[PDB]
Structures are given as structure tokens and as C-alpha cells.
Amino acid sequence: KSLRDMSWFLRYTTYAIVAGDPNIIVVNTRGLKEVIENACSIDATIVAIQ
Amino acid sequence: MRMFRITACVPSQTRIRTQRELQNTYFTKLVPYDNWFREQQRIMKMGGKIVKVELATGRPGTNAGLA
Amino acid sequence: SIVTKSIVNADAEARYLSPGELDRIKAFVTGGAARLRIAETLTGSRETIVKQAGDRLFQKRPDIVSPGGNAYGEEMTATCLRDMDYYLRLVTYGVVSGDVTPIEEIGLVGVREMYRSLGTPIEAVAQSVREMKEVASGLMSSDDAAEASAYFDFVIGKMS
Amino acid sequence: SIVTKSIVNADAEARYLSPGELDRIKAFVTGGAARLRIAETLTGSRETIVKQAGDRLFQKRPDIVSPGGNAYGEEMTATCLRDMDYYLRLVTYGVVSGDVTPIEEIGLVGVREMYRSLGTPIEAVAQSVREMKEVASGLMSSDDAAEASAYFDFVIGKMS
Amino acid sequence: SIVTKSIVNADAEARYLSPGELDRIKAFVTGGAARLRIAETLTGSRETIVKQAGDRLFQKRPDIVSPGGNAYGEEMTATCLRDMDYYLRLVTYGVVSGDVTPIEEIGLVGVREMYRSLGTPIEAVAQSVREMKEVASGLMSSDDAAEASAYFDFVIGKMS
Amino acid sequence: SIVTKSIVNADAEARYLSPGELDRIKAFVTGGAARLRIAETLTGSRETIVKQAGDRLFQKRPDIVSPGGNAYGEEMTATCLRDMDYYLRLVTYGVVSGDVTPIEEIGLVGVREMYRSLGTPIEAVAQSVREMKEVASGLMSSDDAAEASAYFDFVIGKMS
Amino acid sequence: MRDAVTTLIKNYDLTGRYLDRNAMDELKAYFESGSARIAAAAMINANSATIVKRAAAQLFEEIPELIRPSGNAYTTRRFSACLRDMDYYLRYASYALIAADNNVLDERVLQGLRETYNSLGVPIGPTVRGIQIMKEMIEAMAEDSSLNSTDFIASPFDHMTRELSELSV
Amino acid sequence: PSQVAFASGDPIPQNVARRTPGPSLNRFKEMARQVK
Amino acid sequence: MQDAITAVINSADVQGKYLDGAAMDKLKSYFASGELRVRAASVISANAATIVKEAVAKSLLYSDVTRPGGNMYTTRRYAACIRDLDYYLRYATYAMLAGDASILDERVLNGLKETYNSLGVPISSTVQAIQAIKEVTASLVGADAGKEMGVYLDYICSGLS
Amino acid sequence: MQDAITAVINSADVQGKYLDGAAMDKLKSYFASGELRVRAASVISANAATIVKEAVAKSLLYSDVTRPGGNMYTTRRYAACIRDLDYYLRYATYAMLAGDASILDERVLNGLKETYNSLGVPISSTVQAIQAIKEVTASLVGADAGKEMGVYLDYICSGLS
Amino acid sequence: MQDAITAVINSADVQGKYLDGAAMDKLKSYFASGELRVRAASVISANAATIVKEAVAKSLLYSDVTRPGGNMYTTRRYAACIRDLDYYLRYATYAMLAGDASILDERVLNGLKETYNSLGVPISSTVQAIQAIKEVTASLVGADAGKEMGVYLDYICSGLS
Amino acid sequence: MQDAITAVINSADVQGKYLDGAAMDKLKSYFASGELRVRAASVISANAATIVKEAVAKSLLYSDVTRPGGNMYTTRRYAACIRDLDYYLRYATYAMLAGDASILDERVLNGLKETYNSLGVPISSTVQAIQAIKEVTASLVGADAGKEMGVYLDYICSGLS
Numbered sequence A: 001k002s003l004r005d006m007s008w009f010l011r012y013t014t015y016a017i018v019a020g021d022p023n024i025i026v027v028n029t030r031g032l033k034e035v036i037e038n039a040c041s042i043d044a045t046i047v048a049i050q
Numbered sequence B: 001m002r003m004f005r006i007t008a009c010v011p012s013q014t015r016i017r018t019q020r021e022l023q024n025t026y027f028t029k030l031v032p033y034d035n036w037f038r039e040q041q042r043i044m045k046m047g048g049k050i051v052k053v054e055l056a057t058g059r060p061g062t063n064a065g066l067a
Numbered sequence C, D, E, F: 001s002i003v004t005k006s007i008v009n010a011d012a013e014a015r016y017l018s019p020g021e022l023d024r025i026k027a028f029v030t031g032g033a034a035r036l037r038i039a040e041t042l043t044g045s046r047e048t049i050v051k052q053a054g055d056r057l058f059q060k061r062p063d064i065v066s067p068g069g070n071a072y073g074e075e076m077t078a079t080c081l082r083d084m085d086y087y088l089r090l091v092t093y094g095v096v097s098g099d100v101t102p103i104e105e106i107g108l109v110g111v112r113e114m115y116r117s118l119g120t121p122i123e124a125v126a127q128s129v130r131e132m133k134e135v136a137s138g139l140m141s142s143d144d145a146a147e148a149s150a151y152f153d154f155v156i157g158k159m160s
Numbered sequence G: 001m002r003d004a005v006t007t008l009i010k011n012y013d014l015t016g017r018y019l020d021r022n023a024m025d026e027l028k029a030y031f032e033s034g035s036a037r038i039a040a041a042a043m044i045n046a047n048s049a050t051i052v053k054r055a056a057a058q059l060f061e062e063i064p065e066l067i068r069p070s071g072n073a074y075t076t077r078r079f080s081a082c083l084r085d086m087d088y089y090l091r092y093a094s095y096a097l098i099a100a101d102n103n104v105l106d107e108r109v110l111q112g113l114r115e116t117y118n119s120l121g122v123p124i125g126p127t128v129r130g131i132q133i134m135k136e137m138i139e140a141m142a143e144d145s146s147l148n149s150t151d152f153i154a155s156p157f158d159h160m161t162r163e164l165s166e167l168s169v
Numbered sequence H: 001p002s003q004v005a006f007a008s009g010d011p012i013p014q015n016v017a018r019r020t021p022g023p024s025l026n027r028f029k030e031m032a033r034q035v036k
Numbered sequence I, J, K, L: 001m002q003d004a005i006t007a008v009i010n011s012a013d014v015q016g017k018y019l020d021g022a023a024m025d026k027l028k029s030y031f032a033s034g035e036l037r038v039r040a041a042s043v044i045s046a047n048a049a050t051i052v053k054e055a056v057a058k059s060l061l062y063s064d065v066t067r068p069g070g071n072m073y074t075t076r077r078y079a080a081c082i083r084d085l086d087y088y089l090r091y092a093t094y095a096m097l098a099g100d101a102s103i104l105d106e107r108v109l110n111g112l113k114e115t116y117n118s119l120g121v122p123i124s125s126t127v128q129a130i131q132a133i134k135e136v137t138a139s140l141v142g143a144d145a146g147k148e149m150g151v152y153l154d155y156i157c158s159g160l161s
């Protein structure tokens, strides 16, 4: 799940680069913290995308 | 198409029909080849006795051109 | 034939032959020389087409030639090649008739439940007729290969 | 047209187009230029055929323009030539379409009831259409007129 | 179920249920505990019946797992075994219901044109359900294997 | 009902049921036995309540039953007693439901327009319901009489 | 919107009947079951977020293609919409548990549900599987807790699956 | 100029793959692996 | 149509899994009720015409409906009303045997209101006739099986509503 | 229906072989004759009604056949004979286009001699009508085309006679 | 229905005039485009079942539609969906041959939206199926024929939506 | 709605993979055509009254549609037809610059057939108006931009027909 989330983050980053609008990133990352923090480390995600 | 000249008699089993029923009791007919199987099965599950059947049109052993 | 279909259509409508189908009979009766050229080419070269098409079918789908398949053994592969000879003969009958009614009245009606009973995959039969069509089109002239391949891929479409 | 007739037949048998009907559509597509030339000549000269065939009709059947006739009168002869122009336009439509179903749909279904209500002799209208095909055959080249007279022939067969 | 089938027949004849089918519904609700015992038998043996039946199918027809086959590959064999579990579930539903309607409304009507799109051999799926029948009779008791074999044989008859 | 009002009030602001609504529904459930007793004695004495209240109504308002009145005649008198029985049945429905919305939905929307079309004095219908209230309140305990007279006075307020 | 009392009153009003002993027995049974219905609804009031979260965490493992690409629960927007749908279903199931009648489910859940789900491509089978997962969780939690009557819990979810589900046989 | 023709030009075909069995058939994939 | 058994099989089939324990409990409940359902169906199937006779005598006879000007006046309309009450009794017996009202939803209530409105059939009078059928059937068979019949008879009434 | 082309195909199929040169020569003969067949069919369709009317007018009109006491007296019998002659002309045109008389043997010569013997239709008068039709078509469509039309015409005349 | 030729003829007949120059130009355009349409129809008639096969494998297999509870779970539902795809492909071939989408209005799109709405059929899933049909057809049939088939299948999708 | 970029990203998202080999080609073709498509939009938006003027003058004026008894007789109907042609030109510009006809599907073709069949607007005359639009735009903007507008204008024409 973590590996496909990382590859999916990079995939949607490239898709937003192509689209020219970060709206896809905003929609698909705005509410993600509460669902992802139950079984995955939120600081590890921050350092990962960093 | 090749046709069947058939002759059969079908009796009534359920009702005593008070109208004239000889023409649809005993009849000689011309049925098509593709409909002959279902026509024979229809009258033969109905319960009639077929007395005669021939090929009115066409020839036996026709590989092509029977239509 | 095309003339047979025109006659039975005019008889079913209870009328004389229409101008369009009369012109079709005239153009077919002029182009019959080219149609018989396609016919004599196919009859002269019939054996190499079915041999190459059977070999290409066998390498494409080896489950037929595999044990447990529909044609296991040399006599059953020869029976499959004989069926391909029958289909090529029906294609020649179609291109000399100018219409697909000989292929209907010999080798198209009931063929699905025929190969259902035999256990033969009719999609693999369609693949065999595709191989026959492409080897024949590679062999003979392209302007005539289009006319032959129209009847070939009608046979393919009815197989599939 | 012939395309619509072939599509209707293929839908009636719930199948795709047979290669014979594909060949008939292909040949109609290739040979439509001659039909366009025929229709162009007819619409260019469309008053001349009606003029000469109306003259020949009033010669051969003067009972039509005799008193007590259907087309007795100036306005009645005008409506006569109007019907001739209608049938000429329908013949141009049929020549363009390559099949006679537009002629049948516009001016050959119910024509008997229409002219029976109008009191018009249907065999005399057939004579007028035959004289139109005579004038058109005189006006056109031999093969083009021989091809274009068959739509007139279907009109003659339906009306007489 | 048997109740729905009896009500459908009585409604088709426009009558009430006769004491015969009333006695069969009586016998059915008495034997409900038994037919549920075959139901939990097949539910517990879900991952085993189709395991041995798929093994016997693959050793009997190696063209299925051969290259070019319908079920070549790990993914296609997994889909095949999913179809095995689907049909075993349908046979479980049938022996639960006491009538073949829950079998035939889900997995038997249109199955031929369902599998001709996928190229799946109908006789091979029939042989698969045969091996399901023998494995179920192998690890299930005799007379209840005869009752389950009735519905298995209905699957065989409607499929092949 | 009270359950319906609480669920509707929760659902309008899109949340689950509040503790206040749970306490209200609990009070409704605990008072259900007393409400069922009130409805039971009303439907047990439904004939004598209508009889005595109709007698008191026709003594207090002879104009509605004198000739020229709306209810003059035995058929119209029986229809008036039927209307009184209808409203007593709706009162029992409201007593069961714990609120006034069945009486409102069945017999108190458009009642003024209906009785204006009928020509009936709506104040005399309200007097009839008031006599039903007095007769029914004389047939129960004091708290039960007050609880039923709440729904009765709702009908009084809707009629006048 | 109708509860059990309202639908019994409507059924008797249609025939124009006073409430007889059978109607009194039905209302009596509803009134003694009402305490258990209140207890079950107050139970699922507390745990509702955990119920919908574990329902998603079971449904997306029974059918894992919902969270793979080309599944309808792929993105987190679709994930939050699906969890909001499950919260809707649990809220109206609480309403039907209180009302003891499924007319609230019919009127406010099911009358356009196939229309919306076919319009937006939303599957119905995984949805009713999530309904039954929620039903099994509430039944297990009621069996674990001190609930004397647990038979009525399965009724609104089974009604929702029967109404929404495509007719197989 | 003639690079206006995006839609009116020759279309670029996409590479669209056939759908495969998914993770709901992991049990049957393991079953087929032990079948081999 | 769906009975309880086909409803359980449908609910499991659209999930794609086998019957779990709750399905077994529902089936055993239906098999427990099946004895009473078969006995009640046998009694109704025997005394089918007597129930319709008693209900027509109770609710429809000697009224304005069967008087001239009413819709049960003409004897073809009387025989049609008898046939309709036999329809309701037979399909209510079917729904009792199935334990579900899907048969009534599919063949009985399918446009019955539109049919009766186009014919001019009195909805209130036929609802009272079905009520008389319910009372006569509950008197004939018993409290529990009469209540079971009355559930589907009231379902037919509420479909007519 | 059997034509020249389908006759070639069937004569190949009875032994199962392909098309040889012997079957090729008659097919080339049919392809050579087909243009004349289409031209003759176009002329016959152009004058289909007038041939029948003119042959009827100069063959049997004002005679004992159409006189009272004759078979063709009544307007119904007259219209039946006109329909029969139009059918003979159209089906002989079909045979001329197809290149074989199997269409005549399969559609016209199927139980017609016994029908005419039962109905008392004059065989000699139908022979004279067929000969009048044949000579009018031979005068109209040409010498060789008229003779090839008359081959099928006197074949069906001998079949009906 | 009508093709491009009959559309021009019907427009000129409604106007009441002969074929002018622009009508001749449109006819010449259709006669220019006819050969590609004929060979495209031959290709699609060759690959009729296979286009449907790879399209449904491209879009709908191993998805929620074919999973239990979806609208393509049972075999009769799968057969009906394959039947619908065959209907759409055949009528799109007919519209491609005619050069007009009138047959899609007359035969297909006249009541199919209400039919699918009554049936519960997911029109989004059918739209994705017809997009897969577009892709597989344009893969096999070429470029301009792919454009024509895509236009008519997008017309079918627009009628569905 | 969606455009070519959204279609590419949606297809790659359904696949779950990146923009590997042909999505990049479609995007670079779109961005290569984009500046000239914007220039064509500038020309059309600047001259937009002239295109509908020459289109109505070329195709629909001096006809049965504009004379009494026609669907463009009254001034309200004429101004509505002018506004409809402006709608067609503007939404064709929208689809031409988006690179996808989804805007035409969701805001034009969703209800155009039903509003024209309810109103009585001649479909063939509307098609001729849009054809006059597409040749006027091809003359006024260029051959390549004329074809890039004309594919969407012919999509609207196919939606009409």
C-alpha cells in the first residue's frame, strides 16, 4: 500500500504537471491525512514527499 | 424453395365445435421445407394422423439451388 | 447465384426484374471472365494454399495439434485439411456464382452446431479460413484478391 | 436507393451485408458518374421532353383534350404538363439513386387510387411517360438512354 | 424453488395447488434439514471439490492449459477455477431450493452464446462439472450424492 | 407519529437522532400502554359515544335538523352520524399515534372547503365534535379524559 | 414518511375500520419492542464512525478491485464519497430501526438509488455487500452487548439489499 | 500552418490493454499455482 | 416471483457467496412455517368457492352495487367480480405458500388500479370484498394462518389504495 | 431454383470435384448469352402489358371462347385467364434470364395440368394463346432472342399440354 | 431511414425542385467516399464478433459489472449485453454504409433510453462499452473509416446520454 | 465536460500507468496545434456575425423556410435561428479548442434532438445551415482551420441527422 501510494503520488504529480492546474492534487490530497494516519506514519509520508 | 404437399386428419378432443369443421379437420396443404418440421410437430402433438406427404416441388439430394 | 437471388426476389415481390438488378446481372455477366480467371487460379493453386494455411494455423494455435485437442494424430489433421479443401471449394463456387447462396446451401447452415457436436472450435475454423484468405491474397493478384477475399471474409464472418 | 434496399434486406435477415450486395454498392458507386450525367442532361433539357411528349400525346390521344375529356381545358392541360414534369423529376431521382424505390414511394404507390379519384386515364398517363422516354432516348446517347429507359420501364410497368 | 415452480405451474393452469405438490412441499420441508446438510457439506468442501475436479479436468484435457488454449496461463486458469466455484455454488443453490430454477436462471440460459464470445469449450466445462460430480460423490455419502447428482446431471444436460 | 416527527427532525438537519429525540421516543413508548387503553375504550364505546353526542348535538342545535336545515331527513341524519363516527375513528387513530397528524392528514385538510361545498355548518360540526369530547371524557379517568380531549380540541381548533 | 404505527393506521383507514384486537396486538408488540429498538439505536449512535470505517476496511478487502485503478472507489474523493454513502445508509438504517418500518428507507434511500448509481457508474453489488457487512457488524455488536432482542436489526439492511439489488432469480 | 489539424488530421491510436483478473481472484491464482 | 427460499438465494447470489448461518436460520424458519402454510393452502383450495360465496353474500349482495345502476348488476359483471375474487383468493394462497408478496407485485397489482379505473370498477367496494374474503378465510382456517392470509390480502388492498 | 451456374455447381458437387474445363465451357456460353438475355428481358418488361393485350385481342377476342357458352365468358374467368397469361409471360421471362426451365418445372408445372383438366380449361386454346404470345415476343424482341424465348415458351407449352 | 442520396432526394422533393449544383456536389462527395465505406463494411463484417470480444474484454471483463451484483453477472445478462453490442455494431455499420445516422434514430435510439431506464441498465457502462467498440474498430478498420465509425458510435452514445 | 488532456489523463488513470508512448504523442500534437487553434478562435470570435450572415444568405434565405408557411417566417423565429447558429459556431469553437466533442455531447446534443422535434425545426435545413457555416469558416479562416472546425461542425450535423 505504501509503495503504490508513493508511485501514485508521483503519477498524480506528473498528471497535474501536464494539466497545468493543481486541482487534482488538491482534491485527492486535502482529506487524505485522517484516513492515512490510522495505519501509516504521517511524518514518514511528509519526509517521503519531501 | 422446395415445398411439401401433405394430407392429414386432425380430430377434436376437448370441445364439440358446433360450426363446420371438415375443412380444418381433413385438408391437403402446401407447407414450406423450413416450416414442415414445426408444422408436422404441431399437428402431431395435436394428435392427428397424416395419411400422405410428398415433395410437390424440388428434387431429393439437392446440394445447391433448392431455394 | 446472383441471378437466382434476383429471380427469387422478383418472384417473391411478384414483379419483373428491377433496373438495378438487371444492371447487376449485366455487369456480372461481363465480369464473369475475370471471375473464372480467379477460379482457375484457385483450382490450379489449391493445394499449396491449404498446406501453408494449415501449417500457419498449427503454429498459431498448437492446442489443436496438442494431445487432448480436436485434431490429435495425422489422420485427424488430414481430416481438418480435407475440411479446409471443402471450404476452399465452396469459396470457388461462391466466386463463380457471384453470390454466397452456394456456401449457404452447402457449408454454412448448421455449421455452428455441427462443430459443436464434433467438438471442433469454430473460432479456430475461422482462423483457418483467415490463413487461407491471407495466403491466397499473397499468392494471386491483389485486384482479384480483393474480390476473392470478400467471399473469403464473408465465410470468416459466418464462421465466427 | 440501392444502399437503403440492401441495408433493409440485411436488417430483415439480421445479418451484415453480403459481398454480392457490397459488390452492387461498389459498382453503383463507381458507375454513378454516368447517372449524374444523365440526370444533368435531363434537368438541363427538362422543358423540352415535356414539350415534345405533350405534343405527341395530344396527337396520339386527342380524346384527352377533346370536350368531355379529363384534360380538356387550358388549366387542365397545364396540370397535365405539371404531372409530366413531376414524373420526369422522379425519373431523374431514380437515375441518381440507382434504385426505383424513391419513384415507388413518391409517385407509384396509390397512383391508381389518385387518378381514379381524379378521373384520369392511367394508360394515357403511361403513354405520356412512354413518349417522354422516346424523347429522352432521342436526346441522349445510346448506352446512357438504354440505361435510363429502365426507370421509365418500371414506371410503365406500374402504371399500365 | 419447488414452491415457486409448483405455483408457476398452477398459475399457468389457472388452478390451486393439488394435494400432490402439497405433499411434495410437505416432504421438502421435512427433508430441509437433510438438504441443508448437503449444503454445509459442499460449503465446507468448497475449496476441495473444485480443486480435485480442476486437477482431473486439466489432466484429462491438456489442450485447455496448452498454449493457444482458452485457459492458458495463471490468470486464465484462475478465472476457470472461479467459474468452477461459481457452478459449484449454483449446484449448492439448486440442492437448497429443491428445483433447478436457481441454477438455470443464473448459469444456464444464454451460456452457449456467453461462452462463444470467450471461446470457452462447452464440452470441456461440462466435463469439469462431471468431475465436480464424481469428487462430490467421492467425499459425500451415497444417496445424498444421488440427490446432488440429479442437479449436477441437469447442469450437464443443459450445458452439453 | 411522534417517532415520525423525531426521525424527520433529525433527518432534516442530516444527523442521527438526538438524545432529546431519544427521550421523547422513550416517553412515547412508556405512554403507549395508557394511549392504547384510551384508544381501546374509545373503540369499545364507539357506538354509544356517537349516539349520545349526536342526541346532545341535535337537542342543542335543532336548526340543522329542522326542515330547511342541512341534515333534515333520516338519510341526512344517518350521514351526519356517519361523519361523527368518522371523526371518532380519526380521534382513535390520533390517540394511537400519540399526536394529531393522522387526523390532520385524513380529515382536517380541506375540511372547510369540503363542508362549504356540502353546505354544512362547520361550527355545528365543531359542536358535534365538542359533544363527542364531553361524552368520551365522561367515560374515562381524568388524565385519560384530558389526553383524549387534547386531540378533540385539536379537531375543534381545526374546524373553528 | 410512515412508521409501523402510521402504516397500520393507513391500512385500517383504507378499509375504514376501527382498530380491532389484532391491531391492538400489533401496537402492543411494537411498544414492548420499542425499548430494545431505542437501546439498539443508542448503541449504533455511539459506534457509527467505527462501523462505517471497519465496513470499508472489510469491503475493500473482500472486493479489492474497488481501490485498484478503474475501480469506482479509487481516488480519495471517491473513497470519501463512498464512506459518506455508507454513513447515509447507516443513518437511515438507524431511522428504520427506530420506526420499525422500511417506508423511510423506500422514500428517502431506494427510490432513485439505481438511477443515481447507473448514472455515475457506481456498482450495486459491492454496495449491498457493504450493507450486509454493516448488518453483520451491528448484529455481532448487539450479540456482544446486553441486547435481549436482536431479531429486528437485520430487517432494514435485508430490505435495502432486496430493494436495491438486481433480481438474480 | 498545416499543423492546425489535430482532430481533422490522422488520429493517434492509443495502446489500451485487456483487463486482467484482479486481486479478488488471489485465492484462485494461488489455487492455480498449486495446481500447476 | 420469489419465495423466502429464492429471496435468500438471491441475497446470497448477488453477494456471490454461499449460504451462511443466518441464511440457514431463515430457511429453517420457513420450513417450520411450511406445515401451517400447506395445511392452510389445502383448506382454502378445498373450500375455494365457499369463501367467495360467503364474502359476496356478506359485502356485495343486496346493495346498490348489485342493484341496477351498480357495476355488479349485469350478470357478466357479476361473474367477472366472482372471477376477480377467485383471483385474489388464489394469488393470496400463492403468496401465503411463498411467504412473500412478489407474486402479487408482479401479476396482481401490475396496473390493476388503471384496469379498474378504465373499466369503472368500484375500488372501495372491491376493497370491502377483499376484506370480507379476509374475514371468511380467518374464520375458516384459524387465527395464525388467517392472519398470514390477511397480510397478503391487506397487501392487495394497499396496492389497490 | 436451378440455373446454368447452379447446375454447374451441383454437377461439380455430385462427385465432389472442382470445376473442370467441360463445366467451364457451358458457363462461358452462359456468360456470352447473358447480355442478350438481359436485353430481351428489358424489352419484354417494357412491353409486358401490351404484348398480352395485343395477343389476346388478335388471338381469342370476339370468338367462341369469350362468347357466352365459352370458358372465358365471365369477367372473373376473363381476369383469371389474363392473370394466367401474364404469369406465363413473366415466368418464361424468368426462365429466359435464368437459362433453365427448372423455374417453370418448380413454380408453374407443379400440379397445373390436373388443375386445368379438373376445371375444364381448354388445352388447345391455351396452346394458341402461348403461340400468339411467342410470335408477338419474337416479332418484338428480335429473331434470335425471340427464338430463345420461344424455346422456354414451347417447353412450358408442351409441359402444360 | 435514408442514406445521403435519399436525404438529398427528399430535401429536393420537399423543396419541389430538381437537383441543383450543390446537390450534385454532395452526391459526388458520397460517390467519392463510397469505396472506403464498402471496404470498411467488409472488414467489420469479417471481424464482427471479434470486435465485440476485444471491446468487452477491453472495458467490462473483470469489473464490477461482471462481478456478482453487477448487471452482467448472470449468463442471460451477459448474453443480452453481447446481443446489445452486436446490435450497436451492426447498426453502426449500416449507418456507415448509408452515410447517415437516420437508421440509428428509426431503429435504435427511438426508445432505447426508456428501455434501459426501465431495465436498470447502466448507460455509463454501455457508453464505455461503445467507446471500447470505437477503439477496437478503429484499430482494425483504418483511419477515415475509423473516423466515420467513431462519429456514428458517438452518435449512439449521445442518444444514450 | 472534458477535453483531450482530461481524456488522456483519465485513460492513463483507468490503466493505472503513466503516459508511456502515445499519450505523449497526442498531447504534443494538441499543444502543437493549440496556438493556431487559438488564432482561429480569435478570428471566428472577431468576425462571428459575418459567418452567420453569409451562412443564412447562402443556404436559408429566399426559400420556403423564410416565406410564409415556413419555420423561419416570423421575426422571433428568425432571431432564434440566428441565435442557434451563433450557438453552433460558439460551441464548435469550444470543442475545437478543447480537442474533444464532450462539450457538444453534454451542452448541445443532450437535448437538441428533442427540442427540434418538439418545436418542428427542419432537420435538413438546419444541416444545410451548418454546412453553410462550415464552408464560410473554411473560406474566412483557412483550409486547415476550416477542417478543424468542420469536423466538429459535421459532428453537430451528425447529431442533427
Ligand SMILES: *[C@@H](C)[C@H]1/C(=C/c2[nH]c(/C=C3N=C(/C=C4\NC(=O)C(CC)=C4C)C(C)=C\3CCC(=O)O)c(CCC(=O)O)c2C)NC(=O)[C@@H]1C
Residues within 6 Å of the ligand: L057, L060, L061, L062, L063, L066, L067, L068, L073, L074, L075
Ligand atoms: C425596405 C423595406 C428596406 C429593405 C429591405 C430588405 N429586406 C431584405 C431581406 C429580408 N427581410 C425579411 C423580413 C421579414 N420577413 C417576414 O416574414 C417578416 C415579418 C412579417 C419580416 C420583417 C426577410 C425574411 C428577408 C430575407 C429574404 C427572404 O425572404 O429570405 C433585403 C435583402 C437583403 C439581402 O442581403 O438579401 C432587403 C434589401 N432594405 C432597405 O434598405 C430598405 C430600408
Ligand SMILES: *[C@@H](C)[C@H]1/C(=C/c2[nH]c(/C=C3N=C(/C=C4\NC(=O)C(CC)=C4C)C(C)=C\3CCC(=O)O)c(CCC(=O)O)c2C)NC(=O)[C@@H]1C
Residues within 6 Å of the ligand: L065, L071, L072, L076, L077, L078, L080, L081, L082, L084, L085, L087, L107, L108, L112, L115, L119, L121, L122, L125, L126, L129
Ligand atoms: C436555424 C438555426 C433554424 C431554426 C431554428 C429555430 N430555433 C428556435 C428556438 C430554439 N432553439 C433552441 C436550442 C438551443 N438552446 C440552447 O440553449 C442550446 C445549446 C446552447 C440550443 C441548441 C431552443 C431551446 C429554442 C426555443 C427557445 C429559444 O429561443 O431558445 C426557433 C423558434 C421556435 C419557435 O416557434 O419559437 C427556431 C425557428 N429554424 C429553422 O427553420 C432553421 C433551419
Ligand SMILES: *[C@H](C)[C@H]1/C(=C/c2[nH]c(/C=C3N=C(/C=C4\NC(=O)C(CC)=C4C)C(C)=C\3CCC(=O)O)c(CCC(=O)O)c2C)NC(=O)[C@@H]1C
Residues within 6 Å of the ligand: B010, B011, B012, B016, B017, B019, B020, B021, B022, B023, B025
Ligand atoms: C353419427 C351419425 C355417427 C358417427 C359419428 C362420429 N362423428 C365423429 C366425428 C366427426 N364428424 C365430422 C363431420 C363433419 N364436420 C363438418 O364440419 C361437417 C359438415 C358440416 C361434417 C359432416 C368430423 C369432421 C369429425 C371429426 C371430429 C370433429 O368434431 O371435427 C366421430 C369421431 C369422434 C372422435 O374422433 O373420437 C364419430 C364416432 N359414428 C357413428 O357410429 C354414428 C352412426
Ligand SMILES: *[C@H](C)[C@H]1/C(=C/c2[nH]c(/C=C3N=C(/C=C4\NC(=O)C(CC)=C4C)C(C)=C\3CCC(=O)O)c(CCC(=O)O)c2C)NC(=O)[C@@H]1C
Residues within 6 Å of the ligand: E064, E070, E071, E072, E076, E077, E079, E080, E081, E083, E084, E086, E087, E090, E106, E107, E118, E120, E121, E124, E125, E128, K057, K060, K061, K062, K063, K066, K067, K068, K073, K074, K075, K078
Ligand atoms: C474453466 C472450467 C473453463 C474456462 C473458463 C474461463 N472463463 C472465463 C471467463 C468468464 N466466464 C464467465 C462466466 C460466468 N460468470 C458468472 O458470474 C457465471 C454464473 C455464476 C458464469 C457462468 C465470465 C463472465 C467470464 C468473464 C470474466 C469476468 O468475470 O469478467 C475465462 C477467461 C477468458 C478471457 O478472455 O479472460 C476462462 C479461461 N476456460 C476453459 O477452457 C475451461 C474449460
Ligand SMILES: *[C@H](C)[C@H]1/C(=C/c2[nH]c(/C=C3N=C(/C=C4\NC(=O)C(CC)=C4C)C(C)=C\3CCC(=O)O)c(CCC(=O)O)c2C)NC(=O)[C@@H]1C
Residues within 6 Å of the ligand: A001, A002, A003, A004, A005, A006, A008, A009, A012, A025, A028, A029, A032, A035, A036, A038, A039, A040, A041, A044, A045, A048, G057, G060, G067, G074, G075, G076, G077, G079
Ligand atoms: C505509509 C508510510 C504509506 C501509506 C500506506 C497506506 N495506504 C493505505 C491506503 C490508502 N492510500 C490512499 C491514498 C491515496 N488516495 C489518492 O487519491 C492518492 C493520490 C493523491 C493517494 C496516494 C487511500 C485513499 C487509501 C485507502 C484505500 C485503501 O484501503 O487502500 C493504507 C491503509 C489504510 C487503512 O488500512 O486504514 C496504508 C496503511 N500511504 C502513504 O501515503 C505512505 C506512502
Ligand SMILES: *[C@H](C)[C@H]1/C(=C/c2[nH]c(/C=C3N=C(/C=C4\NC(=O)C(CC)=C4C)C(C)=C\3CCC(=O)O)c(CCC(=O)O)c2C)NC(=O)[C@@H]1C
Residues within 6 Å of the ligand: I060, I061, I062, I063, I066, I067, I073, I074, I075, I078
Ligand atoms: C327464481 C327463478 C330462482 C331463484 C332465485 C334467486 N336468485 C337469488 C339471487 C340473485 N340472483 C341474481 C341475478 C341477476 N341479477 C341481474 O341483474 C340479472 C339479469 C337482469 C340476474 C339474472 C342476483 C344479483 C342475486 C343476488 C341478489 C342481490 O341483489 O344481492 C336468490 C337469493 C340467494 C341468496 O342466498 O340470497 C334466489 C333465491 N332461486 C330458485 O330456487 C329459483 C330457481
Ligand SMILES: *[C@H](C)[C@H]1/C(=C/c2[nH]c(/C=C3N=C(/C=C4\NC(=O)C(CC)=C4C)C(C)=C\3CCC(=O)O)c(CCC(=O)O)c2C)NC(=O)[C@@H]1C
Residues within 6 Å of the ligand: J057, J060, J061, J062, J063, J066, J067, J073, J074, J075, J078
Ligand atoms: C361501352 C359502355 C364502353 C366500352 C366498350 C367496349 N367493350 C369492348 C369489348 C369487350 N368488353 C368485354 C367485357 C364483358 N364480358 C362479359 O362477360 C360482360 C358482361 C357481363 C362484359 C361487359 C369483353 C369480353 C370484350 C371483348 C369482346 C369479346 O367478346 O371478345 C370494347 C373493345 C375493346 C377492343 O380493344 O376492341 C369496347 C371499346 N368502351 C367505352 O369507351 C365505353 C365506355
Ligand SMILES: *[C@H](C)[C@H]1/C(=C/c2[nH]c(/C=C3N=C(/C=C4\NC(=O)C(CC)=C4C)C(C)=C\3CCC(=O)O)c(CCC(=O)O)c2C)NC(=O)[C@@H]1C
Residues within 6 Å of the ligand: J060, J065, J071, J072, J076, J077, J078, J080, J081, J082, J084, J085, J087, J088, J107, J108, J112, J115, J119, J121, J122, J125, J126, J129
Ligand atoms: C387463359 C389462357 C385460358 C383459361 C384460363 C383460366 N384460368 C382460370 C383460373 C385459374 N388458373 C389457376 C392456375 C394457376 N395458379 C398459379 O399459381 C399459376 C401460374 C403458376 C396458374 C396458371 C388458378 C389457381 C385459377 C383460379 C381457380 C378458380 O377458379 O378459383 C380460369 C377460371 C376457372 C373458373 O372456374 O373460374 C380460366 C377460365 N381458360 C380459357 O378459356 C382461356 C383461353
Ligand SMILES: *[C@H](C)[C@H]1/C(=C/c2[nH]c(/C=C3N=C(/C=C4\NC(=O)C(CC)=C4C)C(C)=C\3CCC(=O)O)c(CCC(=O)O)c2C)NC(=O)[C@@H]1C
Residues within 6 Å of the ligand: K060, K065, K070, K071, K072, K076, K077, K078, K080, K081, K082, K083, K084, K085, K087, K107, K108, K112, K115, K119, K121, K122, K125, K126, K129
Ligand atoms: C451491455 C452493453 C450492457 C447492458 C445490457 C443489457 N441489456 C439488457 C436487456 C435489454 N436491452 C434491450 C435493448 C434493445 N431494444 C432494442 O430494440 C435494441 C436494438 C435496437 C436493443 C439493443 C432490451 C429490449 C432488453 C430486454 C431483453 C430482456 O427482456 O431480457 C440486459 C438484461 C437485463 C435483464 O435481463 O434483467 C442487459 C444486461 N447492461 C450492462 O450492464 C452491460 C454493460
